[PDB]
Design a protein around this ligand. Structure first.
Ligand SMILES: Cc1oc(-c2ccccc2)nc1CCNC(=O)Nc1ccnn1-c1ccccc1
Ligand SMILES: [Mg+2]
Ligand SMILES: [Zn+2]
Length: 313
């Protein structure tokens, strides 16, 4: 009840900034997460015993893969923390509760392979979930863990609030499927520009929460250059492993996953920044002005990749 989490001074200050890096000390990440829930939600949102038991079950169910791991879960939860703290009065009690949990759980039991690789492999999960294959699986794992004895961190919510929060989490996790991002942003762009965007329209909030989820999920591109560059290695480590597995299935992978075409990474990063990242943080900044630092950091990292191509680094 009267038990606050406190971080050292440097972390206490830097955790409030969008570009914060959670550091290489795994044993501090749970405390960092709880700190962010207490400041974002309140010391009352969750029974600390239940929350702590939930956090460690979620950690156990992330795998030791190069990128889609426990560090990513906490990194994406921190970007959401930053968006929520800079947009205080725009989000309901339940939304602040739901979205931090959604972010922590959004890649549960990820194996480092795309939906396309599961489909080409003919993985059982591809037969169970025809679209957003891993994302339906990640939500499934969230419900499973929530149903372990002593793990239901929402037990103090009413029946209807409980259904609302699980629906917030489900939509939030499905939205992290980048195949759904393109259409969601295009619709949000049209709505903002024609002036029809209405945050009291539930289907509109849905879309805006989806875009926040894309923004948090891609937040590696919003870090300081050395963090962005070193995360890109983890990202390509999985892509090239998947490429290797495509070749084993007798399929030439797209160049992005072919470790023979490493040379082409700088240009591929440019395309991703231009086709995905910049559009994402631009629309987010239009709808939520205080998220501008994400757009600014993203632009700075585009410039850094342009410099890599020009042989200036
Ligand atoms: C589109 C393209 O083409 C090439 C390419 C490279 C080398 C050679 C030829 C092409 N590279 C890219 C972009 C690489 N994607 C990237 O960085 N994604 C990213 C950033 C932050 N989070 N995520 C992320 C998103 C979803 C799943 C996993 C990670
Ligand atoms: Mg994912
Ligand atoms: Zn993710």
């Amino acid at each position: 009840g009267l038990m606050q989490f406190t971080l050292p001074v440097r972390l206490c200050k830097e955790i409030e900034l969008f570009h914060f890096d959670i550091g290489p000390f795994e044993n501090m990440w749970p405390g960092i997460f709880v700190y962010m829930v207490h400041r974002s939600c309140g010391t009352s949102c969750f029974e600390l015993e239940k929350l702590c038991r939930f956090i460690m079950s979620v950690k156990k169910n992330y795998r030791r893969v190069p990128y889609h791991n426990w560090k990513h879960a906490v990194t994406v939860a921190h970007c959401m923390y930053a968006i929520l703290q800079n947009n205080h009065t725009l989000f309901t009690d339940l939304e602040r509760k739901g979205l931090l949990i959604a972010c922590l759980c959004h890649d549960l039991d990820h194996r480092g392979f795309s939906n396309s690789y599961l489909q080409k492999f003919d993985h059982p999960l591809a037969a169970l979930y025809s679209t957003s294959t891993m994302e339906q699986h990640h939500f499934s794992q969230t419900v499973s863990i929530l149903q372990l004895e002593g793990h239901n961190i929402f037990s103090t919510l009413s029946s209807s609030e409980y259904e609302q929060v699980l629906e917030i989490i489900r939509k939030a996790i499905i939205a992290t499927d980048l195949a759904l991002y393109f259409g969601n942003r295009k619709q949000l762009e049209e709505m903002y520009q024609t002036g029809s965007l209405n945050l009291n329209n539930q289907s509109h909030r849905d879309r805006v929460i989806g875009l926040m989820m894309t923004a948090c999920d891609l937040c590696s591109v919003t870090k300081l250059w050395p963090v962005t560059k070193l995360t890109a290695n983890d990202i390509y480590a999985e892509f090239w492993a998947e490429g290797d597995e495509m070749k084993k299935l007798g399929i030439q992978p797209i160049p992005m996953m072919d470790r023979d075409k490493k040379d082409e990474v700088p240009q591929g990063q440019l395309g991703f920044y231009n086709a995905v990242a910049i559009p994402c943080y631009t629309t987010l900044t239009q709808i939520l002005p205080p998220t501008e630092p994400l757009l600014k950091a993203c632009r700075d990292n585009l410039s850094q990749w342009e410099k890599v191509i020009r042989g200036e680094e």
